[PDB]
Paper text:
The Delta and Kappa variants of SARS-CoV-2 co-emerged in India in late 2020, with the Delta variant underlying the resurgence of COVID-19, even in countries with high vaccination rates. Herein, we report cryo-electron microscopy (cryo-EM) structures of Delta and Kappa variant S protein trimers – both in the unbound state and in complex with the ACE2 receptor – to gain insight into how their mutations underlie changes in ACE2 binding and antibody neutralisation escape. Within the receptor-binding domain (RBD) of the S protein, both the Kappa and Delta variants share an identical substitutional mutation (L452R) with the previously emerged variants of interest B.1.427/429 (Epsilon).
Having identified that residue identity at position 484 likely affects head-to-head S protein oligomerization, we aimed to further probe the chemical properties at 484 that mediate this dimerisation. The oligomerization state of S proteins harbouring charged residues at 484 (E484, K484), along with the Q484A and Q484I mutations demonstrate that abrogation of charge at position 484 is necessary but not sufficient to permit dimerisation. Rather, a combination of charge neutralisation and additional contacts enabled by sidechains at position 484 is required for S protein dimerisation.
Numbering used by the authors:
A (entry chain A): 299 to 329, 531 to 620, 641 to 675, 691 to 694
B (entry chain B): 943 to 1041
C (entry chain C): 398 to 496
D (entry chain B): 14 to 69, 77 to 145, 158 to 176, 185 to 247, 257 to 298
E (entry chain B): 745 to 827, 856 to 892
F (entry chain C): 745 to 793
G (entry chain C): 992 to 1041
């Protein structure tokens, strides 16, 4: 956060500092074996990309090979070896935000991975994303540092 | 058409996001709109030029999107300031202001 | 950097060139600054019986880095059969001399 | 072997309306419940398509310019239409493409053939004389009141020959039925040759000769934009011609 | 994910930082807009259980206990009638809390007049 | 009227559509502004003679 | 050559459209003010000072 803000003192707040990427683990070329449910680099008949290949309920017509959504992005594909339909979910990219009080007060921080489930990264799951380093409490206070979706963080340790 | 004002904002935001996505399919004068195809078909001295063309086109698209988002944000901020004024003066009190 | 090459290979002493001595003998970076100097030396670096003192790397597994020198006189495996440091079928010396 | 057919009856060619036919899938991409605007060689809606008959004495086998693409509509019963003649000069000087469907299979050949002036087949109850230099041969599975409707689209793009086809069960007696049916892509051929002229291949019925009852339609493909509707199951159910009228525009 | 593209993109400087900062300013501005419009009371008022308002009926604008969303019938109708590096940040105030703020404003203006906007 | 220029311009995508849409929005906004300012009555009142 | 002319003219047109959008926002604010004055000064008597 100090590196991003170009300052040695950080004011109390939430600062988006980095971009979480689910790194591709394997390379699947189908024209090797096929690996599903993982963020892999797929190469299907010259069409390459990175994604999670899951089972699809979309029934393609026999002449069709790839699938596109409204925004013309490839979200469905057919494996050439075995004629099955696979959904290509994009890997869980997210924004890494750092929630901290003032450095005059404390050096404790919490990390928010925006729009990322907590199983794909004091760990709490919010609709905004996964918050690591903040203890979730059942009490309600005024909002000090906004997290989102009704979640706020404060220092009293860091609580959400 | 009762709730057209909110639907226009939703449609404009969705259409701007869709246009920003569809700008990725344009090559902007390069041989292809895909970076992988350029990196696999050409050596780095010419792939650098083609990637530079794609970079400047996509950067121009992103700047255009951010600029129009800022203009729409100013419009929405004006509407929200008006809504806060109506909340203070029409709901929290009785207003003598005509219309 | 001083060396002796052929007459047709002087185009390969340049940034961003694809070629044979560019890949396996002498590579220049894409951001190279400086000057390449070439002059004919048929009167000095040639013999009527054949001047074989100048050698080039005919065979290598991979392209060089910029400003990388390879003087290793190890054998090359040009086939499926391993060579075990001995010349033979599809086993060639990497350094061959200009005639 | 060639035979001149000298028992034809002179009649001008007919014309009729295309309605909303001739649509095909522009690519191999599945689309679900979305509207896609595409710029390609398409057949114009409600266009003037040339109508040819085979009835007894009518035997319509002329040579027509290919242009940028060919839409072939066939109101067919008993399988009289068997194949097509593709080329530029239709002689041994150049290389020509032959499409035939005999009693067993379909044969696609790119060779230097000597075409007859009147090529035909025959069924008992003769299309070339020579073949010199062949470069491509491809044997495939058979594609096939008027009971059958056969739609075909032939395109020559970048040396690729695209054949799109659709089989439709109809019960209309004379003209083209009014409806919507998108043509699936059937086969892409790596031919890499120039084609500017085509000719239909018919089959005779012998019992001289008799022509079986068939009717076919020729339409020409033009570069235009279509707005295609894709349903939940991914089939094209409706289309809009962007250059037909201001409403569809 | 192209590293060569990012290496060439570094030649253009801090354009990406400016775009991200402008979008962040817009994103916090939206939450500020919602805060200015709806969070005008710091007391959450409730209507009495007996809706005896001298014949005046507010059932279409008061929250419906039968609905799980705790919205008014008018608010429920309004919510039903409105239908690559990109992320959508959730709003700070959820629809339930905005509905709760409107419920507090309605309860204040029904039970207390304009007095709650100027003091106790 | 250069067809080569338009063919090269189609490579840049929907910039032209965006600009036309923005100008159309401004054009209808001007009529909305005049409608909001001056058309505040639906009855055409007349002074006595 | 046409690529250079196209990028220059497209930049000029984008600059013009952006300036027009900002001026349109200013004129819209002025028109909203004028509509408020029409409602509160012409169609009624205003207690708002100045
Ligand atoms: C069928 O008729 C055609 C046209 O009348 C014949 O083609 C001609 O054949 C003669 C024979 O030497 C040539 O001199 C002409 O140049 C041909 N004309 C054209 C336009 O090619 C054809 O030969 C006839 N078939 C048979 C079997 O005789
Ligand atoms: C207040 O208004 C509501 C809604 O108009 C009334 O509820 C209706 O009551 C009648 C008979 O009691 C029913 O037939 C309707 O179906 C009800 N409508 C709804 C939407 O529930 C209610 O009676 C009114 N009075 C009070 C005291 O609540
Ligand atoms: C089709 O063309 C013929 C002449 O080629 C013409 O007589 C006829 O009227 C045309 N039909 C339509 C529907 O335009
Ligand atoms: C059909 O044609 C193919 C090749 O031309 C041939 O092998 C086959 O025997 C033919 N069948 C009949 C029934 O003529
Ligand atoms: C084509 O056929 C003719 C006649 O058989 C022959 O003379 C010629 O060499 C052939 N051309 C090629 C390229 O084989
Ligand atoms: C294709 O054939 C036509 C007619 O014979 C001719 O005009 C055209 O130039 C040919 N094209 C090529 C590329 O040979
Ligand atoms: C799509 O397919 C399903 C079969 O699962 C069928 O029930 C439905 O009617 C089809 N819809 C259309 C529009 O064809």
């Amino acid at each position: 956060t100090k590196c991003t803000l170009k300052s040695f003192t950080v004011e109390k707040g939430i600062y988006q500092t980095s971009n979480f990427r689910v790194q591709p683990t394997e390379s699947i070329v189908r024209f090797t074996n096929l690996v599903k449910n993982k963020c892999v680099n797929f190469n299907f008949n010259g069409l390459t990309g990175t994604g999670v290949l899951t089972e699809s309920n979309k029934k393609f017509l026999p002449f069709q090979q790839f699938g596109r959504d409204i925004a013309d992005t490839t979200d469905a594909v057919r494996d050439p070896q075995t004629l099955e339909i696979l959904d290509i979910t994009p890997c869980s990219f997210g924004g890494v935000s750092v929630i901290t009080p003032g450095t005059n007060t404390s050096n404790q921080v919490a990390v928010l991975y925006q729009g990322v489930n907590c199983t794909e990264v004091n760990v709490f799951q919010t609709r905004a994303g996964c918050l690591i380093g903040a203890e979730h409490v059942n009490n309600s206070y005024e909002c000090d540092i906004p997290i989102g979706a009704g979640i706020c963080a404060s220092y009293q340790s860091i609580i959400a | 058409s009762a709730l057209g004002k909110l639907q226009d904002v939703v449609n404009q935001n969705a259409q701007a996001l869709n246009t920003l996505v569809k700008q990725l399919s344009s090559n902007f004068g390069a041989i292809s709109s895909v970076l992988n195809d350029i990196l696999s078909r050409l050596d780095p001295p010419e792939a650098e030029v083609q990637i530079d063309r794609l970079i400047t086109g996509r950067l121009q698209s992103l700047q255009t999107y951010v600029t129009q988002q800022l203009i729409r944000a100013a419009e929405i901020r004006a509407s929200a300031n008006l809504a806060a004024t109506k909340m203070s003066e029409c709901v929290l009190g009785q207003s003598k202001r005509v219309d | 950097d001083s060396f002796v090459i052929r007459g047709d290979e002087v185009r390969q002493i340049a940034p961003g060139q694809t070629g044979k001595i560019a890949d396996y003998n002498y590579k220049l970076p894409d951001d190279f600054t400086g000057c390449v100097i070439a002059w004919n030396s048929n009167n000095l670096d040639s013999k009527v019986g054949g001047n074989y003192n100048y050698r080039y790397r005919l065979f290598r597994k991979s392209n060089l880095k910029p400003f990388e020198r390879d003087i290793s006189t190890e054998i090359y495996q040009a086939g499926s059969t391993p060579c075990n440091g001995v010349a033979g079928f599809n086993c060639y010396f990497p350094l061959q001399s200009y005639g | 072997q060639c035979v001149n057919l000298t028992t034809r009856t002179q009649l001008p060619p007919a014309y009729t309306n295309s309605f909303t036919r001739g649509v095909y899938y522009p690519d191999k991409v599945f689309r679900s419940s979305v509207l896609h605007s595409t710029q390609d060689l398409f057949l114009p809606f409600f266009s003037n398509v040339t109508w040819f008959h085979a009835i007894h004495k009518r035997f319509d086998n002329p040579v027509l310019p290919f242009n940028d693409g060919v839409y072939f509509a066939s109101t067919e019963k008993s399988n009289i239409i068997r194949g097509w003649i593709f080329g530029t000069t239709l002689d041994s000087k150049t290389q020509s493409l032959l499409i035939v469907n005999n009693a067993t299979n379909v044969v696609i050949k790119v060779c230097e053939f000597q075409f007859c002036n009147d090529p035909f087949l025959g069924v008992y109850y003769r299309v070339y004389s020579s073949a010199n230099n062949c470069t491509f041969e491809y044997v495939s599975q058979p594609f096939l009141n008027f009971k059958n409707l056969r739609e075909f689209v032939f395109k020559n793009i970048d040396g690729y020959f695209k054949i799109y086809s659709k089989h439709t069960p109809i019960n209309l007696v004379r003209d083209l039925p009014q409806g919507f049916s998108a043509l699936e892509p059937l086969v892409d051929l790596p031919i890499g040759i120039n084609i500017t002229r085509f000719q239909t291949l018919l089959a005779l019925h012998r019992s001289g000769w008799t022509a079986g009852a068939a009717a076919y339609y020729v339409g020409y493909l033009q570069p235009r934009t279509f707005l295609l509707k894709y349903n939940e199951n991914g089939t094209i159910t409706d289309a809009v011609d962007c250059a037909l009228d201001p409403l569809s525009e | 994910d192209s590293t060569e593209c990012s290496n060439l993109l570094l030649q253009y400087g801090s354009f990406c930082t400016q775009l991200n900062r402008a979008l962040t300013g817009i994103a916090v501005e939206q939450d500020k807009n919602t805060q200015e419009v709806f969070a005008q009371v710091k007391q959450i008022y409730k209507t009495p259980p007996i809706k005896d308002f001298g014949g005046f009926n507010f059932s279409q604008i008061l929250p419906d206990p039968s609905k799980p969303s705790k919205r008014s019938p008018i608010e429920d109708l309004l919510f039903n009638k409105v239908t690559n590096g990109l992320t959508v940040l959730p709003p700070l105030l959820t629809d339930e809390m905005i509905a709760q703020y409107t419920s507090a404003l309605l309860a204040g203006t029904i039970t207390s007049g304009w007095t709650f906007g100027a003091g106790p």
